[PDB]
Design a binder for this molecule. Structure first.
Ligand SMILES: CNc1ccccc1S(C)(=O)=O
Length: 185
C-alpha cells in the first residue's frame, strides 16, 4: 500500500477513557491500570470495557495512522462514530457505529455482524489503519509483514464524524498489561 503519505498525528482523549486506563503525558500511549485511576465519572467515558477515543474527528478526506500492539493477548482497533453508545453492554459492529478488528484467544477477527475470521500468517506487532471518508472504506494493514492487507470494510455508512477507536483489553491472565502505542510518522 502507498497510504503512508495521508499520515495524521493521533492523540488520545482522556475524557472518553474508561476510568481504569492510564494515558501517557504525550497522549500517545494507553494501558490498563491495576485499579480505578482517581478521575471523576462523565457521560463520555466507556463504562464496561477498557476503551478510549482519539481526540481527532474526521468528516472528509483520507487519513492513515499506525498502532503498536507488541506482546498483547487481546485488543480492538479501528474507527467509530462520534455518537457511539458509551454505557452498558454492546457489540462492535457497523450497525452500532464501529469499523474494527481485534485479537482474542489467539485468533484475529473483523467486527462484522457476525464476526469474520482473518487470515494472518505473521502475527502483527504494528497495525496500519486507513480511512477514505468519501469512498466509504476502512482498511487494516500488517506493518510487520511489509504492509500486507488484513481486512477492508467497504460500502461503509459512517453517518457522522469518525473518531479513532482503541480497546487495550482486560488483563485477567496477567499477560495483557502491555500498552497500545501510537507510532511515529
Ligand atoms: C509501558 N508499560 C509499563 C509502564 C509502567 C509500569 C509498568 C509497565 S508494564 C511493562 O509492566 O506494562
Amino acid at each position: 500500500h502507498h497510504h503512508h503519505h495521508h499520515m495524521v498525528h493521533i492523540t488520545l482523549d482522556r475524557n472518553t477513557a474508561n476510568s481504569w486506563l492510564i494515558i501517557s503525558k504525550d497522549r500517545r500511549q494507553v494501558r490498563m491500570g491495576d485499579t480505578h485511576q482517581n478521575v471523576s465519572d462523565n457521560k463520555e467515558r466507556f463504562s464496561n470495557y477498557p476503551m478510549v477515543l482519539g481526540a481527532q474527528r474526521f468528516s472528509s478526506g483520507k487519513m492513515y495512522w499506525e498502532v503498536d500492539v507488541t506482546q498483547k493477548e487481546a485488543w480492538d482497533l479501528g474507527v467509530c462514530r462520534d455518537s457511539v453508545q458509551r454505557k452498558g453492554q454492546f457489540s462492535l459492529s457497523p450497525e452500532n457505529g464501529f469499523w474494527t478488528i481485534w485479537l482474542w484467544q489467539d485468533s484475529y477477527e473483523a467486527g462484522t455482524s457476525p464476526q469474520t475470521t482473518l487470515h494472518i500468517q505473521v502475527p502483527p506487532c504494528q497495525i496500519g489503519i486507513f480511512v477514505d471518508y468519501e469512498a466509504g472504506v476502512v482498511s487494516f494493514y500488517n506493518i510487520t509483514d511489509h504492509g500486507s492487507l488484513i481486512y477492508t470494510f467497504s460500502e461503509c455508512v459512517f453517518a457522522g464524524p469518525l473518531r479513532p477507536f482503541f480497546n487495550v483489553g482486560f488483563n485477567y491472565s496477567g499477560g495483557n498489561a502491555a500498552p497500545l502505542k501510537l507510532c511515529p510518522l
